[PDB]
Amino acid sequence: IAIPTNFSISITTEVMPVSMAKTSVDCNMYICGDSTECANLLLQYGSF
Amino acid sequence: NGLTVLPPLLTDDMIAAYTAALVSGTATAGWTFGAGAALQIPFAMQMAYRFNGIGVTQNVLYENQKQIANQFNKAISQIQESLTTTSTALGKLQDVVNQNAQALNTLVKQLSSNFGAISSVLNDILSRLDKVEAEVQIDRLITGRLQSLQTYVTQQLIRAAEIRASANLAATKMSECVLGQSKRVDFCGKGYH
Amino acid sequence: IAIPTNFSISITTEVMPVSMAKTSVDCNMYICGDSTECANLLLQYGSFCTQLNRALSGIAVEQDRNTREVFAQVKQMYKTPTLKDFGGFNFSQILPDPLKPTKRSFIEDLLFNKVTLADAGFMKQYGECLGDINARDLICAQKFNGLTVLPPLLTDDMIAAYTAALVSGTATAGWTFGAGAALQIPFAMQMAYRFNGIGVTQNVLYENQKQIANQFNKAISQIQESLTTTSTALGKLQDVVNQNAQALNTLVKQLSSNFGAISSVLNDILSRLDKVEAEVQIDRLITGRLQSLQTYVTQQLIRAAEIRASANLAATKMSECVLGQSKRVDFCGKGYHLMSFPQAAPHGVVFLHVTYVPSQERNFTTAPAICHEGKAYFPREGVFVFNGTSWFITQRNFFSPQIITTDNTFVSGSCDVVIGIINNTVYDPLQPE
Amino acid sequence: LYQDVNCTDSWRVHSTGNNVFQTQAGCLIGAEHVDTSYECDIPIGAGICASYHTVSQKSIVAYTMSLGADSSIAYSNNT
Amino acid sequence: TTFMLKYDENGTITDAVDCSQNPLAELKCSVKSFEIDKGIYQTSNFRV
Ligand SMILES: *[C@@H]1O[C@H](CO[C@@H]2O[C@@H](C)[C@@H](O)[C@@H](O)[C@@H]2O)[C@@H](O[C@@H]2O[C@H](CO)[C@@H](O[C@@H]3O[C@H](CO)[C@@H](O)[C@H](O)[C@@H]3O)[C@H](O)[C@H]2NC(C)=O)[C@H](O)[C@H]1NC(C)=O
Ligand SMILES: *[C@@H]1O[C@H](CO[C@@H]2O[C@@H](C)[C@@H](O)[C@@H](O)[C@@H]2O)[C@@H](O[C@@H]2O[C@H](CO)[C@@H](O[C@@H]3O[C@H](CO)[C@@H](O)[C@H](O)[C@@H]3O)[C@H](O)[C@H]2NC(C)=O)[C@H](O)[C@H]1NC(C)=O
Ligand SMILES: *[C@@H]1O[C@H](CO[C@@H]2O[C@@H](C)[C@@H](O)[C@@H](O)[C@@H]2O)[C@@H](O[C@@H]2O[C@H](CO)[C@@H](O[C@@H]3O[C@H](CO)[C@@H](O)[C@H](O)[C@@H]3O)[C@H](O)[C@H]2NC(C)=O)[C@H](O)[C@H]1NC(C)=O
Ligand SMILES: *[C@@H]1O[C@H](CO)[C@@H](O[C@@H]2O[C@H](CO)[C@@H](O[C@@H]3O[C@H](CO)[C@@H](O)[C@H](O)[C@@H]3O)[C@H](O)[C@H]2NC(C)=O)[C@H](O)[C@H]1NC(C)=O
Ligand SMILES: *[C@@H]1O[C@H](CO[C@@H]2O[C@@H](C)[C@@H](O)[C@@H](O)[C@@H]2O)[C@@H](O[C@@H]2O[C@H](CO)[C@@H](O)[C@H](O)[C@H]2NC(C)=O)[C@H](O)[C@H]1NC(C)=O
Ligand SMILES: *[C@@H]1O[C@H](CO[C@@H]2O[C@@H](C)[C@@H](O)[C@@H](O)[C@@H]2O)[C@@H](O[C@@H]2O[C@H](CO)[C@@H](O)[C@H](O)[C@H]2NC(C)=O)[C@H](O)[C@H]1NC(C)=O
Ligand SMILES: *[C@@H]1O[C@H](CO)[C@@H](O)[C@H](O)[C@H]1NC(C)=O
Ligand SMILES: *[C@@H]1O[C@H](CO)[C@@H](O)[C@H](O)[C@H]1NC(C)=O
């Protein structure tokens, strides 16, 4: 049998993601910008 | 283009305060503050208890206290030096940040794609075409950009599921490795935790 | 060092979703209703509906699997004991009442009252919907559009029977029925073993049996009272139910959206336009409604992945907290886990985690080791403390000072190495002779 | 299996050839009910399972699922 | 009506399924195979 006679204290790093960026989208702004006609067409298209 | 990033509720200072409280609690109380009321204990005796945890008698810790403390300090200094260089140790967090930024930027860039319409420039369409033909082209563009947003949101949901698995594992690690000594093999570091 | 002198028995509730609604879609019904022309056009467009239904059927089978993995962890359905009192521990609230017609326990009744499940039962006859048109029932609206909810394989009664069997097994056998054949054991002895399993000697449990039983009963009553209130304790299960209902209802509402077509009403298009232009508009509508169904199925898959993670965790909790005592920190309730009980709830489970919380800490002067003659004795199993006049050795989680003696100490080395050694005397049992 | 049809006592079914009877999951047509409980082979729902069994010839038989082997394991306080 | 035809190695129609004959035929047409495994399958909602 092999028996250890000495020891070491090791310190190892474990990197763990916890959160990601919280984001929100102004659907009308992205799809239509500042166009009024596009905004009306988007309303007619349906609110997804 | 309507894409905004909201600040996290807990500031970096608040998270640092939580971390400092956790470190101070484990230094002063140890594992006892994860179950009930924090019970004070000298750090050397806590070390003796945690040595007994991994099957090594307490006399090993007490009779080699200075050597073990020096080894701990040297390990701390080594991690400090390794972090001080320009390594990629934090590649996972950088990957998360890059993924978020890339998703938003590709969302911005996809606005240039015609989706079967004569152009991707809404103002050009509305300047050349009257209500009906402009409506046809703009409907094509709306379908395409809605698809882009839906793809972004679906990818965000999948990434959020992965991040939630990581965060649940991190909470489990906080409970079982920081607030107590884990007997699970290779859960809290490699070796006898 | 601070050593607790007293303790409390705490019972805490952990609510875990285990399954969500099993759903199926009649793709033709949702997209085309009862139109033959639209059905032919959908055939020509291409059958992506088989893929959608394959995914949804996988989800449904997964829901049944989740429930089976969480609850069907007993080989034999142990009979409910006639007497609900075990050594003073009163199990009446968590076991079915022989007299009442419910067949479930009282706490289970409260839990099933807390959550609003919308429609009861999964059967809605055509005559029923046609006879109450004035009330725009949501279920009729979504059934008329091809969206159906399938009943879970295990009924609430069978799940309650599983829970009753688990509770009875842990009451009569304990942890032994999770490994091999259920071995009978008196409940007080089981509690003594589970006390030993968190570093507290059995003497503590036996010598304070009545007080501990009273604390357990009072905790049961307090959870009962807190549940007997309009509090949102079961917000997770209600959230699951609301999510399913909202997904189906938004699917129903999305039928009103023009997808670039002149109208969202198929009958209007077919009444005004001939085959070709109608085909163009109906192709737009088919694309849009197919996208709506695909979004629904994708979101259902993601929600089902989350629910499966929850169900796997719940199965792990049932294995490690109900069928055994877990040493993992903060896995089975907060504190030194003693045991756990499952209670069925709509679309999920509720774990009553019984834990030992130390309290009433007293400060003492401590010493890492004791120098006697010329050797350093160490506590072995315990810790040295100064009671004010004499040094004692006591267990960490409960102040029970004991005379320091060679039996409870082991010697190692000399006193020079020890840093904070304290001079003291160590008795020897052979000294009586 | 018709989930939204009551046939306990014209029904909205296809043929109603024979062996029509009601279960918690709805009106089942073409299966012979058996009062014995077995393990689930084809889960029908609401605690009802189907299988292919030799009948008093082989036929589809619907029954109540068996939850497991019932046992007593009576409690005692000194054994 | 809708039929599922079978073309063999030589390209001759050797078999067919009439999707509207009975629920089993509808299931066969939906899964696009002449062989169905043992189990329970969702089919079209009751049509009148
Ligand atoms: C186990 O081996 C260690 C030395 O091993 C090496 O150092 C350890 C601290 C760990 O980092 C190991 O991974 C590594 O291989 C023995 O104790 C150490 O030995 C040194 C050198 O002999 C001792 O000297 C100390 O430091 C300097 C240099 O000698 C002098 O000023 C002093 O004499 C002082 O003692 C030292 O005590 C010790 N290391 C310390 C205190 O940090 C160790 O003896 C051996 N096993 C056992 C059971 O003793
Ligand atoms: C710890 O403190 C308890 C009292 O503390 C309070 O009550 C507990 C039951 C818990 O709810 C605590 O969170 C709470 O702060 C002392 O127990 C008190 O006296 C007796 C004896 O311990 C308790 O029960 C007794 O049990 C037997 C059998 O009946 C008989 O001695 C008595 O008839 C009595 O029932 C009693 O419930 C409790 N008092 C109250 C108001 O709850 C306890 O003595 C102390 N620690 C130790 C080690 O004894
Ligand atoms: C499916 O249909 C069965 C039988 O058909 C029922 O009776 C017919 C004459 C028509 O009125 C049908 O519309 C009606 O559904 C139903 O079974 C019936 O269930 C009810 C409710 O449990 C029973 O009423 C109860 O009967 C006794 C005696 O009064 C007491 O429990 C109650 O006071 C209450 O009246 C009814 O007797 C029972 N009928 C038969 C013939 O057994 C069934 O509810 C229905 N729906 C399903 C199965 O989902
Ligand atoms: C175990 O706990 C249960 C809690 O459900 C105890 O049953 C409860 O016992 C009390 C006291 O006898 C009953 O209160 C009585 O109710 C009616 C009026 O509502 C009347 O009989 C009395 O005036 C008294 O208030 C209570 O109803 C009863 N609850 C149930 C659901 O049965 C049970 O006694 C406990 N067992 C032991 C051995 O301590
Ligand atoms: C226990 O502590 C006392 C007080 O010192 C405190 O605790 C130490 C462990 C360390 O963290 C100090 O910085 C703290 O202030 C120790 O007393 C020291 O011992 C020397 C030498 O005997 C004495 O002359 C000094 O007054 C103290 N020095 C300092 C810097 O406070 C004591 O030795 C400790 N006992 C044990 C067993 O470790
Ligand atoms: C048709 O092709 C077959 C070989 O293909 C197999 O048989 C087919 C009928 C069909 O079932 C395929 O899916 C099969 O893979 C030919 O069969 C042989 O034809 C030769 C003459 O060419 C004749 O002498 C053999 O007896 C036939 N039998 C076998 C078993 O090979 C068949 O001839 C083709 N039909 C023609 C050429 O008209
Ligand atoms: C300490 O131990 C002695 C031993 O007799 C006992 O009388 C006393 O009450 C204990 N408590 C304190 C605070 O000294
Ligand atoms: C313990 O006693 C020894 C003699 O037996 C003495 O030399 C030593 O100083 C004492 N230790 C302390 C900490 O008082």
Author numbering:
A (entry chain A): 681 to 728
B (entry chain A): 825 to 1017
C (entry chain B): 681 to 1113
D (entry chain C): 584 to 592, 605 to 651, 658 to 680
E (entry chain C): 247 to 294
What does the primary publication say about this deposited structure?
Of the spikes solved in this study, the NTD, RBD and receptor binding motif (RBM) of WIV1 share the most structural similarity with SARS-CoV-2, with RMSD values 1.6 Å, 1.1 Å and 1.7 Å, respectively (S4). WIV1 has been proposed to pose a significant threat via direct transmission to humans, as both full-length and chimeric WIV1-CoV replicated efficiently both in human airway cultures as well as in vivo in BALB/c mice models. Previous work has shown WIV1 to bind ACE2 orthologs and sustain low level infection in human cells. The WIV1 structure, captured in a near-native state, shows an altered tertiary structure compared to SARS-CoV-2 by virtue of a different hydrogen bond network. Previous studies have also demonstrated that the presence of a fatty acid in the FABP is responsible for regulation of the “up” or “down” conformation paradigm of the RBD, whereby presence of the acid ensures the RBD remains in the ‘down’ conformation and loss of the acid appears to permit adoption of the ‘up’ conformation. These structures reveal the presence of linoleic acid in the FABP of all three SARSr-CoV glycoproteins. Remarkably, the maps reveal a conserved network of water molecule coordination of the fatty acid inside the FABP. These waters support the acid within the pocket, in addition to a single putative hydrogen bond formed between the carboxylate head of the linoleic acid and residue R382 of the spike protein, at distances of 2.4 Å (SZ3), 2.7 Å (007) and 3.2 Å (WIV1). (b) The biliverdin density in WIV1 is continuous with the density for some of the pocket residues, namely L110 and N105. Further, N709, N1134, N1074 and N1098 are glycosites on the distal end of S2 near the transmembrane domain of the SARS-CoV-2 spike and are conserved in WIV1 (except for N1074) and SZ3 (except for N1134). Coronavirus SZ3, which originated in bats and transmitted into civets sometime in the 1990s, is thought to be the result of a recombination event of bat CoV strains Rp3 and Rf1, with the recombination breakpoint at the nsp16/spike.
SARSr-CoV spike proteins cover the coronavirus membrane and are exposed to the solvent environment in preparation for contacting a potential host cell, undergoing a suite of conformational changes to bind the viral receptor known as angiotensin converting enzyme 2 (ACE2, in the case of SARS-related coronaviruses) and mediate membrane fusion. Each spike is composed of three identical monomers containing key domains involved in restructuring from the pre- to post-fusion state as well as in receptor binding. These include the S1 receptor binding domain (RBD) and N-terminal domain (NTD), the S2 fusion protein (FP), heptad repeats, and the transmembrane domain (TM), among others. Here we report three novel structures of SARSr-CoV spike proteins belonging to bat SARSr-CoV WIV1 (hereafter WIV1), and civet SARSr-CoV SZ3 (hereafter SZ3) and SARSr-CoV 007 (hereafter 007), at resolutions of 1.88 Å, 1.92 Å, and 2.10 Å, respectively.
